[PDB]
Amino acid sequence: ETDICKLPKDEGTCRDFILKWYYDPNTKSCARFWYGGCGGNENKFGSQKECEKVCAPV
Structure with a gap:
C-alpha cells in the first residue's frame, strides 16, 4: 500500500502521449x-x- 510500484502503466488519456x-x-x-x-x-x-x-529490481 502507498507503494507506487503497485500502480499500472499510465497512458493518461490526454493530448500529449509521449513515450516513458x-x-x-x-x-x-x-x-x-x-x-x-x-x-x-x-x-x-x-x-x-x-x-x-x-522502485528498483529486487
Whole structure:
C-alpha cells in the first residue's frame, strides 16, 4: 500500500502521449509505454534507471 510500484502503466488519456518507462512488479524492472500529462497516475519515468532509483529490481 502507498507503494507506487503497485500502480499500472499510465497512458493518461490526454493530448500529449509521449513515450516513458514504467515499473512492472511481475519482473520488477521497467518497460516503455505512451503517457499523457493530465488523465493519469504516477508509475511513469524518463529512463529505466530513474525507475530503478524509485522502485528498483529486487
